[PDB]
Amino acid sequence: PVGQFIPYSHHVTDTIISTKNAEYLSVWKIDGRSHQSASEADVFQWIRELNNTLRGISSANLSLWTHIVRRRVYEYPDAEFDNVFCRQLDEKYRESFTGYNLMVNDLYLTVVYRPVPDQKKHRQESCIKALEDINR
Amino acid sequence: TLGQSFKRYGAELLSVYEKGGHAFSAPLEFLARLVNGEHIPMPICRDRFSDYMAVNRPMFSKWGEVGELRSLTGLRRFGMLEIREYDDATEPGQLNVLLESDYEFVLTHSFSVLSRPAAKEYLQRHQKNLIDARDVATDQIEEIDEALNQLISGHFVMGEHHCTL
C-alpha cells in the first residue's frame, strides 16, 4: 500500500537500510558546484568527468535517485546579541528581512542495490564493498 | 513507606479528606479528571460510583480517530497515543519537554509487579528472543542477562509497564 510497502526497515549496517525484499539503500548528502561563478566549459568538463566516474557503475541492478529539495530555512536563530551596540546594528539590519529569498536548495542522491540466509548475507557484503568503493 | 520516601517530595496521601461536610469522597474527584477532565467531586452514596461517575459523557464514535466528549460545559474532543518499542536507555531529561505542552494532556504510566516465577519465565523468554541481534552497534546483548542478575539481586526488578497519552 501507499504507506505499507514496507520500504524502510534497517537490518544491514550503518550506511545501508534494507527493505522487505532485500533492496538496499544508502544516502549521500551532496553540496554542489559554484556554477553560478564558474566557466561553463569547465562545468561541461566536470559533467564529462563525473560521467566517466559513472562509467565505473555497472549495470548489476544498480540505480541512483536524485532528490533536490528547496525549503524554507526559517530555523535561523534571529536573536539578540546580548549588548546594545551590536544588537542595535542587528535590528537595523533586521529591518532588511522583508522577504528576500529565504529558502535554500540542497541536493541528495540515493544509491539502491537490487539483487537480480547466506545468499542475503553475501549479497549484502557485495553491496557493502562495492558501495564503499562508490562512496570513496 | 511512600510517605517516608516522598518526605522531600512534598507529596500527600489522598482520600483522607473524605467525609468532609456531607460525606465527600476525596480521591474520586481525581478520578473525575480521569473520567472527563471536570473537577466534579463525587460524595459517597448507596451505589458503586462506576454506575454514576460518567457525568460528562465520553464517546468513542470515531474508530481510532478523534473521539468526542459530551459535557454540560460544552462539547470537547480527545485523541490518544500509545507507546511501544521502548528505548532501554534512561536519559535524565526524559519527558521534561512538556514545559509549555499546549495539549491539555493526561499521561498514564502503568505498572504491575512480576511474580518471580513469572519474572524468571519473562527473563528466560527475553534471553531466548532478544539475544539473536544481528550486529547491533548499541550493545543490546549485555542488558538481557545483566537484567536477570539484577532481578536476582533485586535492583533492576522489571514489571508490566504500559503507557498512554
Closest CA of chain A from B135, distance in Å: 8
Q: Which H or E run contains B57?
A: strand B57-59
B140 three-class SS: coil
Q: Please give the grid coordinates belonging to residue B14.
A: 489522598
CA angle A78, A83, A84 (to 5 degrees): 100
Q: Please give the grid coordinates belonging to residue B60.
A: 468513542
Longest dimension (CA), chain A: 67
Size of interface A-B (CB pairs under 8 A): 3
Beta-sheet strands, E only, within A4-122: 17-18, 24-30, 62-72, 103-113
Resolution, Å (one decimal): 4.1
Terminal Cα-to-Cα distance of chain B (whole angstroms)? 29
Q: Whole-angstrom Cα distance, residue B130 to residue B144?
A: 8
Method: cryo-EM
Task: Please name which of B70, B15, B69 lies closest in space to residue B43, comparing C-alpha atoms.
Answer: B15
B143 three-class SS: helix
* Phi/psi of residue A11, nearest 5 degrees: -140, 30
**Amino acid letter at A57?**
I
Strand B67-71 vs strand B162-164: parallel, antiparallel, or unpaired? unpaired
Q: Whole-angstrom Cα distance, residue B136 to residue B130?
A: 11
Please say whether the beta carbons of B70 and B56 come within 8 A. yes
Any CB–CB contact under 8 A between A19 and chain B?
no
Q: Cβ of A13 and B134 within 8 Å?
A: no
Q: Whole-angstrom Cα distance, residue B10 to residue A132?
A: 58
Q: Report the residue of B85, B132, B135, B136 to disrupt the A interface, i.e. the one with the largest count of A CBs within 10 Å.
A: B135
**Amino acid letter at A131?**
L
